[PDB]
DNA sequence: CCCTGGAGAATCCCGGTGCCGAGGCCGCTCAATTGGTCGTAGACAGCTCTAGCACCGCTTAAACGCACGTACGCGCTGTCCCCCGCGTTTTAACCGCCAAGGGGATTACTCCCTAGTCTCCAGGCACGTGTCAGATATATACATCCTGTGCA
DNA sequence: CACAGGATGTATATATCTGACACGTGCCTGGAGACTAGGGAGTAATCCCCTTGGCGGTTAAAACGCGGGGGACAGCGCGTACGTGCGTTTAAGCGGTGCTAGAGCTGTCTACGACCAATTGAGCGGCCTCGGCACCGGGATTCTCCAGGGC
């Protein structure tokens, strides 16, 4: 179908759209189970839309249909559902055991809808009532969720009774082989039941070419100047080197050797007794104890007098909450955005940090939180004072604010403690990336 | 330097638990200071047990604490417990 | 030749392991020496302590509307019979809970 | 094939399938029951060995179970149970 | 206007209540937080199994509630309704703590 | 004539007994009592001195703690005067 | 065989609470007293017995009622 | 030859038979083996034990104005301190009697 | 003809001359501390013994002595006795 | 008024008796000394699965806080009878002594019971596996408190 | 003061579902069969000790009665703190990442410390004997309780 049909309304769909909805039609004419990896930002809630009209109209069985998202997208989908292609009716599950009760009995259990929205708390709940239906099409959005198996949303979500199945994921590749297995055997667990140049990555690619399409967001927009990236490497301060021998070494209860060295090569305040006495006074006593630190004091004020704007990503509440002491000592306006932030206190945050005339400087992120939005266009510079693991969380970190609103280069800045663990982290999620890139990138 | 303190752990046993305690052992009303008491006798009862089986997991080389080494401190104590061992 | 293999469980007619209780009495350092009907003795105590408490649960099971015993059935066995009582009188039974007892002056009255 | 565990279940399966035909019990239960007879035969063991070393003999006999017996059970089951064990006794001796 | 039961009526249905169940009364993680802030105290780097605190909290619970049997018995015999830490402290004193 | 205050010589003899360490029941009747208990277990038993004379001191001993605590009872229950009530409620809370 | 109960006279009854600690004594207590010592030397005499008996001898020794009273928990010191 | 005999008490410094407790442990039905410490550690934990209990007594003889120990005197001695009574918690002693304490309600107001 | 039996008499009397070199003890007192001296032992032998079963070894060490003290003794007296019990097995490791 | 006198009990100092603790001897049995052996425990690899640390998202039951009223704890009074102090009379404990015999304690001997060994094999234990009993949810039907309203 | 009725909590059926109990199976290791050797204990006999039975005199202790005060127990009144129900907040509980090591469990090897045996000499238990500490009585003191200036 080389262009959209009718019955999209609110707008007509784009090429690259109606070629992700060739390639989905492609895809269950010849009866697989796919991943659309089309990367966050590029409409794939519009291209599934776009599907699951295609069988209500042009196809004349449309049955039971399930939709599983994020909680943070419930109501998302369902604008887009009613926005987009009204013709299609869609019923959500959220509420505590009265709202259920009430909306299954009513509405569900009657049968005449065609699409059902739930996300994973919902599905767990009502797994029972969810598989009495027999489904037709299941859609998983953010799919990296089910990459373990034997967890209990994978095991209920291959205990359904699906004709056909469809992945919804911006990064199918994580950490191994094994989660990309995993999403392999919840599509076709036929095909793919075992452990999954020439030997090696030619041949990935040959076996994901079919099931699989994903395109980077450079074809459609051809703007957004691409990342730029600084590494610092930084040494520790003289305390810092002294609890790093004595938790090396070996009173205080030390059992995560790597958990310990972290923070340690973060800032020293965090143990207990590494603080001065009763005044607790907090003047330069934060810079001078973390070289982290003293390299941040260096870089701020520089970008404050220039272009500012600066987003700082940490990995732990308390290094967010000393650099929240030393933000208040600056007397620099600071936002935090933390996993312990109720929702209302976020939004407003995030529009003021994004108002069209601010004066709002810093902004601290727990790299995990949130998820797949927060559009901060108007920051420029991106401070990672760590890095985890995956660097698809540090991606999508620095992504955060190199989002299509920003017109102007965003840099991030990546702190690195020399010889201690930060290299080992850095060289794995590295060596994690380069998978990523030699697996998927093609 | 930034830190709080939440709350001390006695004070984890709560009010209404103690209630429901007392509930069992068959009572109808509870004066407002015995909660103090029953947390001083819980801590000393608790106290005791945990060196008995600290010292049972020391002499036998372990960093864990084992059911088996709770039942053999409180039969010490005298106070068989059947069901763990 | 070599004649058939009889339990002394068997010989004595018990249901339990007349030659297992022989082998911890002598490894539990009670003393050197061990008799022959020592062990039938104990394995016969034992067989009919353990008859007298699983008749009292698993009447208390039926008056319970459940064929399955559980510990709240073993400890309202022991409880309410008076030598059983007075025999397990210090141990705790996990999961037992307590016998409703309510005192006559907290009634309504 | 973990270390082998020796436990009175299935001898306290087989006297429950006498007593109550149609009945069953849980892990929990079971245990129960184990830790009950562990606690008896120590108990047992200990007072019989007691009374040998009073006596100053090196052979715990059934008369030193007999005397433990009755020493710690209270009565009407002390009574039963010396009836049993010495019904038993008499069977394994006339029998072998 | 609203319902409302008299002084006395909810506590006595909450013993029955309470007197036919078996489930455990305290809070599981604050329990495991005290276990462990004990142990703390008399050894250090110390790891608790979890059926350890389980067996703690049983037999806790099986102590309290026998010193709540015997203190209600004390506030009885004092001519009263109300158990005071009066009667806490006789019991202990007469089972010998 | 002079007469005493009722109270004064009980604090006396309550003084005088807790300095003193004897015994005080009459040997004969405690004796006495010692066989006719016996003689429902066992017939024609002997005794030495020394086990009548054990039997009394653990029973002096017993009989003393039990007061205690039933004074302590008493005093609880806002009195001067010990009753069978104490009694009953001292040996329920020991356990007997 | 009987009255050697009432042998235990209500003068000893009462020296044994003054050593206790007791100031005014109600006039029932006499017979709960002798009940209570009734129950104790039943208690220990049955185990003194039954050690004799073990120890196949007719008369009960100072060592018996020691090892009855220590399995009771009523641990002698003073006669072996 | 051989050389003249010297007793493990002598050589551990110890007033108390390591010899006779080694030989009780032996035959007492504890373990099938004994090690050499062992006795040496529990002969002096024994003396310690004793010489607390004795210094104590002789104190309370002293207040007396006794020259001899008497059971009143391990009876005061014991029930005077906390941790000795503690151990010797369920233990009689034979014409000990019983501390002096008077109940403050009973005195004369 | 009476039979040789043994007590702990003559090293309780060398204590007590080493610590009250002038004080002197009875017949009565002398056979409760006979008396204690073997509760004592009977309680940390036994002790010792359910460590070596429960830690399923074969001998008795004084590595197992000590922990039956830390187990039985309260307190000061437990720091105390291993403090008297290690010096006394260091002392009789380097003479020998 | 309290403070003083009388009277009884408790305390302290001295002198004569009794017996029990302390010391000195004999002998015999148990502990020390050498020598030899083996099996128990220490030491060390390899494996594996649970436990700990710092977070994140989500749900919901439980906890916290609060205002009201009501049984209830506590104090104060009055009565009366029960318990205590004291004198008198009687009964049986306590002590001393004597007489007889049952029975505990010891020794010598023999046998029969039990420890230890080797062979054999079957009962018990770990591992899978499937069906049913108990848990849960939900609508009824019943029993239980509590208050008002004629009774005043 | 005694019912009617309302509101609420609790028992009762019935239908669904799931995960633990009960059962079958293969293997292996510990119990049974047959045997021999040695020493623990049953049996008989002897001695002497220590328990029991009895008598007589003593005196302390118990039993009985009497009179009076103080403590127990019922009753009343008050004002207070705890139960009860409702609304808001918090963290307990569940499901996830994310690495590493960490700690416990099993199999193998090998040395040293504990058992065992024979031999011998002091340490310790039983037996006497004797004098100093405790005891017992006596006589001169200090404290304390009770009645009254309502002394
Ligand atoms: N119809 C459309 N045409 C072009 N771009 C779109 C369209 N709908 C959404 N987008 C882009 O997608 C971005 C958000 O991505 P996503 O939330 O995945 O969209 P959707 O929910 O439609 O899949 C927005 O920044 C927007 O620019």
Redesign the pocket.
Known sequence: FEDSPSYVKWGKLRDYQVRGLNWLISLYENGINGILADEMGLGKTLQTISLLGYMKHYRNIPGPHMVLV???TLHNWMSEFKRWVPTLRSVCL????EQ??AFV?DVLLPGEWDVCVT????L??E??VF??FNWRYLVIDEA?????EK??????VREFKTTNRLLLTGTPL???LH?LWSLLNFLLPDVFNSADDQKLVERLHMVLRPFLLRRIKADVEKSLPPKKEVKIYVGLSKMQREWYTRILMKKM?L??????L??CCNHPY?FDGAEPGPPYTTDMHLVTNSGKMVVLDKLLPKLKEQGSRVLIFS??????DILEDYCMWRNYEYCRL????P?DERQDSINAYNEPNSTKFVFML??????LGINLATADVVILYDS???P??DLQAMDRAHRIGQTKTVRVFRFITDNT?EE??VE?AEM?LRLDSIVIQQ | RHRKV??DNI??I????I??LARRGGV??????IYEETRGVLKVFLENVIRDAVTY?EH?????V?AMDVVYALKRQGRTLYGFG | ?????????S?AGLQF????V??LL?KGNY????????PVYLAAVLEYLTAEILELAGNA?RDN????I?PRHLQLAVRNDEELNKLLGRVTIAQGGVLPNIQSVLL?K | ???????????V?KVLKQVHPD??????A?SIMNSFVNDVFERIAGEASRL?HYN????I?S?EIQTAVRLLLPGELAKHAVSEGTKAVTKYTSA? | ??????????????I??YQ?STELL?????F??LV?EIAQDFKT???????AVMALQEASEAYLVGLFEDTNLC?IH?????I?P?DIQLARRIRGE
Do not use: C
Request: net charge positive; charged share 40%; aromatic share 4%.
């Open positions: 994020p909680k943070s959220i509420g505590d055991k259920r009760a009995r996300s994973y708390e919902m767990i709940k797994k029972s598989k009495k990296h969720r089910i990459k373990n967890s209990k949303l994978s095991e209920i994580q950490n191994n989660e209860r059992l995560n050797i790597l958990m310990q972290r923070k965090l990995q732990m509440t308390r290094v967010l933390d996993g312990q932030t929702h727990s790299t995990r939180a949130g998820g985890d693991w995956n698809q969380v663990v080992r982290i794995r994690k | 939440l709350r004070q984890g709560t009010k209404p638990a209630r429901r109808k009303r509870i004066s407002g200071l997991t036998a080389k372990r960093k864990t084992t | 030749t070599r004649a058939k293999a009889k339990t002394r469980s010989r392991p007349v030659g297992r022989h082998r002598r003393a050197e020496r061990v008799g022959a009907g020592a099971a509307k459940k064929t399955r559980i309504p | 094939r973990k270390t082998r565990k020796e436990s009175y279940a299935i001898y399966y009945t069953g019990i849980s892990s929990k079971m040998a100053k003999r090196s052979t006999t008369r072998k | 206007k609203p319902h409302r039961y008299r002084p006395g009526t909810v506590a006595l249905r909450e029955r209540r036919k305290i809070r599981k993680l604050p495991q937080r462990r780097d110390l790891r608790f199994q979890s059926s506030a004092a001519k009263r309704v109300t005071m009066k």
